[PDB]
Amino acid sequence: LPASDFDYNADGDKIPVSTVSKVKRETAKSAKKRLRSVDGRLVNDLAQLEKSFDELDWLAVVHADGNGLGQILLSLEKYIGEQTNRNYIDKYRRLSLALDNCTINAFKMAIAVFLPIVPLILGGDDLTVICRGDYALEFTREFLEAFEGQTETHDDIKVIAQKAFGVDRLSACAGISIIKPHFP
RNA sequence: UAUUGACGACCCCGAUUGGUUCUACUACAAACG
């Protein structure tokens, strides 16, 4: 885009930026708050990992994505049980909230493996975070074990998954880059 | 029953270990005000 505003690069030099880029950077402040608020152990900023954790020799972007919700929602009329509108809304709504809670709860469990971890996106059935490298396969194993364990026990998912796939759980998968800290 | 009647060199290397252990990329420049 054309330049419209000025902002500061990571070196702190003033640079030309678009109004798109400018409003994104303005909002990163409210984002970093909300992500940290999930758990006090979390680090607010990649800069704050660099402050608090100079020992790090590696870093890992984790990206994790929930599985099957789209096909369930495309078919949810089958799975609500009683074929009535009032039940559809309730089941649809609670299922959607339940997966957000499962992702949050599974995340607050998994971080016990470390806290040198910065969340980037954390909501719905979808997670991505910057971990301490050489703790991310273990954090993601623990997260995916805890995401299943959450969706097993979480009543609002349990019965639907049973009718959808014959087991009372959902699943998620993860990509784990594992990167040296200055790498893009 | 125990006689016949003297010659002649050999060995030339043999057995075994034949790799073992550590370091396997490290900082960077692009990420981050």
Cβ–Cβ under 8 Å, residues A32 and A45: yes
C1'-nearest nucleotide to the CA of A49: B32
What dihedral do alpha carbons A132, A134, A136, A138 form, nearest 10°?
-130
Q: Which residues touch strand B (CB under 7 A)?
A: A 8-12, 28, 45-47, 50, 57, 180-184
Beta bridge partners of A175: A63
CB of A52 within 8 A of CB of A37? Answer: no
- Report the first-to-last Cα separation within chain A, whole angstroms: 22
| Experimental determination approach used | cryo-EM
The dihedral built from the CA positions of residue A151, A45, A58 and A176, taken in this order, carries a sign that is positive
Q: CA A108, CA A113: separation in Å to the nearest integer?
A: 10
Calculate the CA dihedral of residues A23, A24, A25, A30 and round it to 10 degrees. Answer: 100
In angstroms, this model's resolution equals: 2.8
In angstroms, the CA A116 to CA A173 distance is 22
CB A144 within 8 A of CB A102: no
Within 7 A of a protein CB, which nucleotides of strand B? 26-33
Chain mean position to CA A31? 13
Q: Residue A123: CA atoms inside 13 Å, Cβ hemisphere, count? A: 7
